[PDB]
Amino acid sequence: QEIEAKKLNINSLKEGLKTEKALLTKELIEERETEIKFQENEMLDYQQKQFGADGNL
Amino acid sequence: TTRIGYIDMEYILENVSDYKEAKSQLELKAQKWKQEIEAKKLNINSLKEGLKTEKALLTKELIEERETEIKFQENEMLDYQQKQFGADGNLMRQKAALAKPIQDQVFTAVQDIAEAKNYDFIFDKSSDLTMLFSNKRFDISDQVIRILNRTD
Amino acid sequence: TTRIGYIDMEYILENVSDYKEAKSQLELKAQKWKQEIEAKKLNINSLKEGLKTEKALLTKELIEERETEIKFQENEMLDYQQKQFGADGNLMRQKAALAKPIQDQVFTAVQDIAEAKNYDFIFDKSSDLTMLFSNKRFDISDQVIRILNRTDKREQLNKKQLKEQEAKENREN
Amino acid sequence: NLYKIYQITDPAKAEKIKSDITNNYPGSRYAQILNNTNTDDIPSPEKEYQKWYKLFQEEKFDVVLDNIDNLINQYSGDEIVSKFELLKANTLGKVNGLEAYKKGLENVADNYPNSDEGKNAREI
């Protein structure tokens, strides 16, 4: 459930970026994409901590 | 009249050599490779989403080349995964190179001990799932360890 | 003290001719399935090339129908491939079912041997790596193979032989 | 279509009609596909749209303004004009603001409701 909440947040961020991908310049798009990538990496770290080969499972 | 002993393969491996540190380093490298595979999967998914977003503006010709590029990336990730984590190669080959000479030496020492002392069965307790209880008196691992240490 | 015997299931399966022949026939069937998959691939590629060659002369509707037909053919090929060679497909299920009668016969023979010779435990040496060193004196695999061959090459006794057997076995009363 | 039908059955009339198409009435695409000459004939998407898309990508919205302004009517008569209108709307939105983008999207939806570009306009 926690991972699903994180996925919902990441999908909301992706949709928010998508709804303005055809309006703003390239620098804002790149910054938002880097933020999305950072969020996805945080999700991957959380998944590896919880369900990973060593820890919390 | 039936003589039974047992060995602990993990205990012998840890005692004779620095197996634990090398195994931990290999595990860290394998985890790094797995994270790289996950990053490649994320990049592929992002490329697929970007292609899906832009389809009307395309001529179906750049769509074809983008699909071929996505397929090439997927195949590259798949072959990288097979090379690193195949049943033979770069993880299994590394683990084999780590633990095979000592395993063969332990097997030879066990056979020599069995022939000399007329053992009937020598069990491997290293699985820890079978062989739940062992008397620890029918334990020949110190002999195996001393035979291994005798060889330089 | 306990008496321990053991078999080697891989060795027994290697020394059964009918099992090897059935495995070879299964491999031949798998090769035929692979050839059928290749034929499906050839048809799919021919359809794709035909669509590509005359893609300019077709309307949007016709292009859509041709693309849907190609996608249907590709999905059918994928379904056939997964059904025949999947992890639980026809090939794997048929491979797993080949040794079941041999396993039944081996189990019965092992029960009978352990009853005859006072064995307390009979292990399958090839099931796992727990058995590191096993003395060959306690390997009953060759006895099981002899039993399996004996039942495979059974022969019905003649009327004279049957009468002699009845007379011999009826001598107790 | 008669050429294809006669190619499947009775190829003599197929060859006759193929020669008729090739020599009497050389089509834009039909003539050079019947004899399989080449892709030399300039297509709508390949021309002034696959490189116009490059201009759109490379952040060059000054020349492409008038380019789309005269190419929206220069290349009328094919489904490409819907993509041209969509590109014009996207450029106008990127250089003017949200209202221009909305006006372009609704104009594209009105002009070509029965197209993939029309569905794109409706969804966005």
Stated as kind and residue range, the H or E segment containing C46 is: helix C17-53
List CB contacts (< 8 A) between D33 and chain C.
53-54, 56-57
Q: Do A53 and B31 touch (CB under 8 A)?
A: yes
Q: Which of A15, A20, A23 to mutate to test binding with chain D, by most D CBs within 10 Å of its CB?
A: A23
Question: Are β-strands C131-134 and B121-124 bridged in parallel, bridged antiparallel, or unpaired?
Answer: antiparallel
Residue B41 to residues B35, B44, B64: CA-CA distances in angstroms?
10, 5, 20
DSSP state of A23: T
Chains A and D touch (3+ CB pairs under 8 A): yes
List CB contacts (< 8 A) between B127 and chain C.
128-130
What φ, ψ does residue C121 adopt, rounded to 5°? -135, 140
Q: How far apart are CA A4 and CA A43, in angstroms?
A: 10
Q: Does B144 touch chain C (CB under 8 A)?
A: no
Using CB atoms within 10 Å of the CB of residue B138, give its burial: 0 to 12 exposed, 13 to 18 middle, 19+ buried.
Answer: middle
Residue whose tokens read 């590109």: D87
DSSP state of C139: B
Distance in Å, alpha carbon of D1 to nearest chain C alpha carbon? 10
User: CA nearest B126: which of B25, B46, B7, B39?
Assistant: B7
Q: How far apart are CA B152 and CA C23, in angstroms?
A: 47
Q: How was this structure determined?
A: cryo-EM
**Do residues C83 and C90 touch, judged by C-beta distance below 8 A?**
yes
Q: Do D90 and A22 touch (CB under 8 A)?
A: yes
User: CA nearest B148: which of B114, B88, B116, B101?
Assistant: B101
Contact partners, residue A7, CB within 8 Å, separation at least 6 = A43
List CB contacts (< 8 A) between D121 and chain A.
none
Stated as kind and residue range, the H or E segment containing D123 is: helix D116-123
**Do residues D83 and D64 touch, judged by C-beta distance below 8 A?**
no
Residue B128 to residues B7, B8, B144: CA-CA distances in angstroms?
12, 9, 19
Q: How far apart are CA A18 and CA B71, in angstroms?
A: 23
Q: How far apart are CA B32 and CA A29, in angstroms?
A: 29
Residue whose tokens read 């990496």: A41
Residue whose tokens read 């197209």: D115
Using CB atoms within 10 Å of the CB of residue B32, give its burial: 0 to 12 exposed, 13 to 18 middle, 19+ buried.
Answer: exposed
Q: How far apart are CA C47 and CA C45, in angstroms?
A: 5
- The alpha carbon of residue B71 and the mean position of all alpha carbons in its chain are separated, in whole angstroms, by 29
Q: Which of D57, D94, D102 to mutate to test binding with chain A, by most A CBs within 10 Å of its CB?
A: D94
Handedness of CA B27, B33, B34, B39 (dihedral sign): positive
Nearest CB partner across the interface for A40, out of B31, B42, B53: B42
**Do residues D104 and D88 touch, judged by C-beta distance below 8 A?**
yes
Q: How far apart are CA B65 and CA B67, in angstroms?
A: 5
User: CA nearest C119: which of C106, C137, C97, C101?
Assistant: C137
Distance in Å, alpha carbon of D8 to nearest chain C alpha carbon? 14
- Please give, one letter per residue, the 3-state secondary structure of B96-150: HHHHHHHHHHHHHHHHHHHHHHCCCEEEECCCCCCCCCCCCCCECCHHHHHHHHH
Neighbours of chain D (3+ CB pairs under 8 A): A, B, C
Q: Do A48 and B42 touch (CB under 8 A)?
A: no
Handedness of CA B86, B87, B92, B93 (dihedral sign): negative
As a whole number of angstroms, the longest Cα–Cα distance in chain A is 45
**Do residues D92 and D124 touch, judged by C-beta distance below 8 A?**
no
Using CB atoms within 10 Å of the CB of residue D59, give its burial: 0 to 12 exposed, 13 to 18 middle, 19+ buried.
Answer: exposed
Q: Do D49 and B62 touch (CB under 8 A)?
A: no
Q: Does B42 touch chain A (CB under 8 A)?
A: yes
Nearest-by-CA chain D residue for B63: D50
Helix (H, G, I), strand (E, B) or coil at D28: coil
Q: Do B122 and C128 touch (CB under 8 A)?
A: no
DSSP state of D9: S
What φ, ψ does residue A55 adopt, rounded to 5°? 135, 125
Other beta carbons within 10 Å of B34:
16
**Do residues D62 and D95 touch, judged by C-beta distance below 8 A?**
no
Q: How far apart are CA B18 and CA D30, in angstroms?
A: 75
User: How many interface pairs between A and B have CB atoms less than 8 angstroms apart?
Assistant: 10
Q: SS3 breakdown of chain A: % helix, strand, coil, rounded to 5?
A: 75, 0, 25
DSSP state of C136: G
| β partners of residue C124 | C7
Stated as kind and residue range, the H or E segment containing B4 is: strand B4-7
CB burial string B37-46: b at 16+ within 10 A, e below: beebeeebee
Instruction: List D residues 19-78 in contact with B (Cβ-Cβ < 8 A).
Output: 45-46, 49-50, 53
Q: How far apart are CA D16 and CA C141, in angstroms?
A: 79
- The alpha carbon of residue C119 and the mean position of all alpha carbons in its chain are separated, in whole angstroms, by 30
**Do residues B5 and B122 touch, judged by C-beta distance below 8 A?**
yes
Half-sphere exposure of residue B45: CA atoms within 13 angstroms, side-chain side: 11
What φ, ψ does residue C6 adopt, rounded to 5°? -160, 155
Nearest-by-CA chain A residue for D123: A19
Q: How far apart are CA C20 and CA C12, in angstroms?
A: 11
Nearest-by-CA chain A residue for B39: A41
Q: Do D94 and A23 touch (CB under 8 A)?
A: yes
Q: Does A44 touch chain B (CB under 8 A)?
A: yes
Q: How far apart are CA B51 and CA B62, in angstroms?
A: 10
Q: How far apart are CA B60 and CA B51, in angstroms?
A: 11
**Do residues B145 and B12 touch, judged by C-beta distance below 8 A?**
yes
Q: What is the dihedral of CA B113, B114, B117, B123, to 10 degrees?
A: 100
Resolution (Å units): 2.2
